[PDB]
């Protein structure tokens, strides 16, 4: 099992112009180890489709060309203003990735819950995501 974690911040989140189905992309990161597989995270600030229009969507994508099908479990969390993990969603098992394949959660968090300052999920209008992946 190859375990790797990535912390990424989206600045000025309440200012994001992406309409439904449009994507904010993280930097490309790496699972290190043997194969140096490359990955990215993709965020739909206003959902992926009309079914998810009230939600932020979050997906893990395999960027590089693997030598074979990759199986990975993943967990996505939001880091709150105090720095603690909250609002986690995790895959119940490993999912199968090829180059260009994404897996994630179309309904990761409700937008209005996310934007409410009383919930402490956007300190200084920054959304910090914490992605943990185990390639099995």
């Amino acid at each position: 099992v190859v375990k790797f974690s990535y912390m990424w911040t989206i600045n000025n989140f309440s200012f994001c112009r992406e309409k439904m189905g449009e994507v904010i992309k993280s930097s490309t990161f790496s699972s290190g180890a043997n194969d140096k597989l490359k990955w990215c995270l993709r965020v739909n600030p206003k959902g992926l489709d009309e079914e998810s229009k009230d939600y932020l969507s979050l997906y893990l994508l395999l960027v590089s060309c693997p030598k074979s099908e990759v199986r990975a479990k993943f967990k996505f969390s939001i880091l709150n203003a105090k720095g603690e993990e909250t609002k986690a969603m995790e895959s119940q098992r490993a999912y199968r990735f090829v180059q260009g394949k994404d897996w994630g959660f179309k309904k990761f968090i409700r937008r209005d819950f996310l934007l409410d300052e009383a919930n402490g999920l956007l300190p200084d209008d920054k959304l910090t995501l914490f992605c943990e992946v185990s390639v099995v």
Binding site: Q92, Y95, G100, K101, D102, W103, G104
Partner: peptide, 7 residues
């Protein structure tokens, strides 16, 4: 349950 945007 995770979902994908792909075949």
């Amino acid at each position: 349950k995770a979902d994908t945007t792909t075949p």
